[PDB]
Amino acid sequence: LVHVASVEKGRSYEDFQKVYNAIALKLREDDEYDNYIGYGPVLVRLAWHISGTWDKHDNTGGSYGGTYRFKKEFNDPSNAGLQNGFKFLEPIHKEFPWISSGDLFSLGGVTAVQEMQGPKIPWRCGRVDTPEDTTPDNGRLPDADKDAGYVRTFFQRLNMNDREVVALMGAHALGKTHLKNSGYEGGGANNVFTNEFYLNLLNEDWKLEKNDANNEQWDSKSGYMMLPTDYSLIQDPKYLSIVKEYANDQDKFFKDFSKAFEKLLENGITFPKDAPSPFIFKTLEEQGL
Ligand code: HEM
Ligand SMILES: O=C1CCNc2c1cnc1ccccc21
């Protein structure tokens, strides 16, 4: 099963920079969403969930086919809440209908990370929408009620190692859980991309509690929370070393996250040898916009 990247006909960097800019301007505009968090976090999660269905064994799932647009995936219980992100991106796709769905969904994640003062994420175009019968079944995204061993084994399906896992999880600096979406009671939220997930894990006073949905979560005296899969990163000695590394090195975290996130978003895609180089988009701030 081979998915070959095919550049949207006649498009180049500046076309995609226009899409980035539209997403970025809408992020700035629609600032009230989710108690003034804005849409950055949910767009990052969307980009991860459209990519996280991938299976290295047969190259099913992944970001290439844009299949989140289909009911079966759109309605995956693991994707509850992501419809807000889809609706946010709707007007952008209407403005730029030439872009593929996979390209738009992944680019939304990139734009969100960057506009939230995260690292630059190189991004490649060429995902091509595939038919409804290519939509992966529900159940390929990870459970949150599990331990480090579950996390490690899960991510092997996505060809991610321990450092890549720990780095990717740092996106949980962002946003929050919503009891009605996932069965987890949200704590303090952020909308700036930092290494604070690691600092919170190491520095807060955590207590294991059972929430009103009957699920276990770790809660701090200051009002933050960790999923059991988050907290597993300080229960496992291999993960803990890396958590400490990122808590003590912002730049290393940024560089490792950027690599892992691009790789996550590109898993399953064959880029021809004469494909364009990855694009590094300028932020609104860098453009004076
Ligand atoms: C073991 C792996 C993971 C598990 C079990 C997990 C689970 C969760 C859950 C349960 C939520 C809350 C959803 C809601 O209630 O609205 C959430 C939110 C979020 N996740 Fe993850 N996640 C994992 C990995 C990741 C990765 C790899 C990324 C991206 C690189 C990511 C980015 C996010 C973001 C940005 C949010 C906040 C969304 C918002 O504020 O609406 N997560 N995750
Ligand atoms: O420590 C934080 C910061 C705010 N956001 C999250 C944290 C930890 N785990 C999370 C898990 C899912 C969504 C957001 C978070």
Side-chain angles (χ1 to χ4, degrees):
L1 193 31
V2 179
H3 291 320
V4 184
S6 184
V7 180
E8 290 93 336
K9 180 175 174 169
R11 306 291 165 184
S12 62
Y13 176 70
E14 302 287 19
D15 297 279
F16 294 101
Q17 181 77 66
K18 285 176 186 170
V19 181
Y20 175 105
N21 287 356
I23 296 162
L25 286 163
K26 193 185 172 61
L27 281 172
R28 179 189 283 175
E29 182 58 27
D30 297 353
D31 71 323
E32 305 184 0
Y33 175 71
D34 204 7
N35 287 125
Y36 285 83
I37 291 166
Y39 281 90
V42 74
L43 290 180
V44 174
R45 193 179 200 232
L46 181 52
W48 138 242
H49 277 208
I50 64 100
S51 297
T53 60
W54 188 61
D55 186 342
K56 69 181 178 183
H57 296 103
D58 63 7
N59 194 19
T60 58
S63 71
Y64 181 86
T67 54
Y68 171 78
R69 77 187 184 282
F70 298 119
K71 175 187 177 63
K72 174 173 63 174
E73 176 170 350
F74 189 78
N75 291 319
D76 184 348
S78 302
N79 289 337
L82 291 180
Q83 308 90 335
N84 294 297
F86 186 81
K87 293 307 171 193
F88 176 99
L89 289 173
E90 270 183 338
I92 305 294
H93 213 168
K94 298 292 180 65
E95 185 176 2
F96 302 98
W98 51 263
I99 195 163
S100 67
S101 296
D103 285 353
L104 184 60
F105 305 147
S106 61
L107 185 53
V110 167
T111 305
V113 169
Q114 305 191 175
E115 295 295 304
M116 297 188 286
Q117 310 163 53
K120 293 293 186 110
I121 319 293
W123 178 90
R124 297 188 87 160
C125 74
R127 293 161 190 82
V128 179
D129 283 5
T130 62
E132 191 154 11
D133 66 356
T134 66
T135 304
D137 288 346
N138 299 355
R140 297 177 173 217
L141 294 163
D143 293 336
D145 61 351
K146 304 290 199 284
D147 68 5
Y150 170 87
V151 173
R152 179 166 291 114
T153 295
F154 174 84
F155 272 104
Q156 288 166 358
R157 198 199 73 221
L158 295 175
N159 189 38
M160 297 294 178
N161 69 27
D162 283 2
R163 298 185 58 84
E164 291 169 314
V165 168
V166 180
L168 284 168
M169 215 73 78
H172 283 179
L174 301 168
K176 67 187 180 168
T177 65
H178 311 81
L179 202 70
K180 296 210 202 72
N181 292 340
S182 58
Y184 291 98
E185 189 192 348
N190 296 303
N191 58 8
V192 181
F193 196 93
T194 69
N195 69 336
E196 283 181 31
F197 176 72
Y198 310 106
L199 288 163
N200 292 345
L201 272 169
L202 295 173
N203 292 339
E204 298 293 307
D205 182 17
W206 297 104
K207 182 166 283 301
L208 184 62
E209 304 192 302
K210 193 195 290 196
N211 68 30
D212 296 338
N214 219 38
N215 292 312
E216 292 200 309
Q217 66 178 69
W218 293 86
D219 295 331
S220 75
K221 308 187 72 73
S222 64
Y224 285 117
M225 62 81 80
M226 293 284 172
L227 303 165
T229 51
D230 294 328
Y231 195 88
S232 86
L233 306 182
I234 67 173
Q235 293 180 310
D236 174 276
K238 306 181 185 88
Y239 282 156
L240 179 56
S241 293
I242 305 159
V243 168
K244 293 173 176 176
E245 180 181 351
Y246 296 149
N248 288 290
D249 197 333
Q250 297 181 269
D251 188 54
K252 179 68 167 157
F253 168 59
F254 270 29
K255 289 170 169 161
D256 282 0
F257 182 87
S258 173
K259 286 176 182 65
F261 193 62
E262 181 177 8
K263 172 181 169 174
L264 178 76
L265 266 52
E266 294 176 356
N267 274 334
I269 312 175
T270 302
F271 291 97
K273 290 286 181 295
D274 60 345
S277 291
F279 303 133
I280 299 191
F281 301 111
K282 296 174 148 195
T283 59
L284 293 183
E285 178 181 51
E286 284 170 332
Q287 296 169 88
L289 298 173

